[PDB]
Ligand binder design. Structure first.
Ligand SMILES: OC[C@H]1NC[C@H](O)[C@@H](O)[C@@H]1O
Length: 323
């Protein structure tokens, strides 16, 4: 079962691409075994021409794969921005990956490049997460069939190059809805652990959060609905139903932002992790270092432990380690 973090050094158009080896050392010493790498294709491509690939960028990803091997940490490479789609609003995509043949051609071009580069790296060490958080399947933007046909033909092209490559598929509705008609060999579907937004995204600048209620748990609030541990259990039970079709599931992003009081964060995260352990669902916290992380999270109500120049939320870490 995968347990770990997302690392963001290739996440943004302003990112350096230089991941920190000590992140891998420390999470290995804390007995974690998984990292997801959400990548912004513009770091090696172009806004106007989605077929540009600057191969030199991937020397940085080569290092991540080496460190994954060195420290026993599986690497999941993800396209967080691809031609025609990203949830990140720092750049507006002028095309629509879900409908536009040219964007889909470029999408496959990029994944074919990546598949070819790492064909020699086994799926024990490396998986591909094709696209981060597709939206709800409003067919005027992305139908269920739009999504499934694109994923299917992308997997086909990847596996002509590397037949054994493990593929991770995000749920629809921003990683929250299982995908019914994708029963493809050697795939995993990825859900999310941000429910409820009143706890996890309180005062978040990048969503419309101004009318969220004061955080509390239980009885947190999520797009009009109130949530508790039993409701979380029901939700993730619908996810592990995919195992009856030979599909594994895991939670590719989870956590709470750094303006939520710590007592609420810990009560909510404990409940989520109790459910994930109950149902044997793996997880990745959205940050290692950062606002959603166990390190350098800039919370005002935490007694941070020294961690080699960083600030460690020990209670959050130990919750993760025990589940
Ligand atoms: O995919 C990463 C993305 N997931 C959705 C979260 O709200 C956001 O904070 C994060 O940047």
């Amino acid at each position: 079962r995968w347990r770990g973090f997302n690392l963001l050094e290739a996440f943004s158009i302003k990112s350096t691409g230089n991941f920190k080896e000590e992140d891998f050392l420390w999470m290995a010493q804390w007995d974690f075994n998984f990292v997801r790498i959400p990548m912004c294709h513009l770091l090696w491509s172009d806004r106007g021409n989605p077929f540009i690939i600057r191969e030199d960028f991937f020397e940085k990803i080569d290092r991540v794969i080496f460190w994954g091997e060195k420290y026993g940490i599986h690497i999941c490479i993800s396209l967080h921005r691809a031609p025609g789609y990203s949830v990140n609003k720092e750049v507006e995509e002028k095309t629509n990956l879900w409908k536009d043949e040219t964007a889909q051609e470029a999408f496959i071009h990029h994944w074919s490049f990546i598949a070819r580069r790492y064909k020699g790296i086994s799926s024990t060490h490396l998986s591909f997460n094709l696209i981060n958080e597709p939206p709800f399947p409003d067919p005027q933007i992305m139908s269920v069939e739009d999504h499934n046909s694109l994923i299917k033909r992308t997997i086909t092209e990847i596996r002509k190059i590397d037949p054994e490559r493990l593929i991770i598929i995000d749920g629809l509705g921003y990683g929250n809805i299982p995908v019914d008609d994708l029963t493809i060999e050697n795939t995993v579907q990825s859900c999310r652990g941000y429910i409820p937004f009143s706890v996890t995204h309180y005062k978040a600048e990048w969503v419309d959060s101004k009318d969220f209620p004061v955080p509390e748990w239980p009885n947190g609030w999520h797009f009009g609905e109130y949530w508790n541990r039993e409701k979380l259990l029901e939700h993730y039970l619908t996810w592990i139903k995919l195992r009856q079709k030979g599909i594994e599931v895991f939670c590719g992003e989870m956590g709470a932002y750094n303006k939520t009081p710590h007592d609420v964060v810990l009560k909510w995260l404990e409940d989520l992790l109790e459910i994930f352990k109950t149902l044997n669902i793996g997880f990745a916290l959205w940050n290692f270092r950062g606002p959603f992380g166990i390190l350098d999270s800039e919370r005002k109500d935490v007694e941070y432990e020294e961690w080699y120049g960083h600030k460690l939320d020990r209670k959050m870490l130990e919750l993760l380690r025990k589940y």
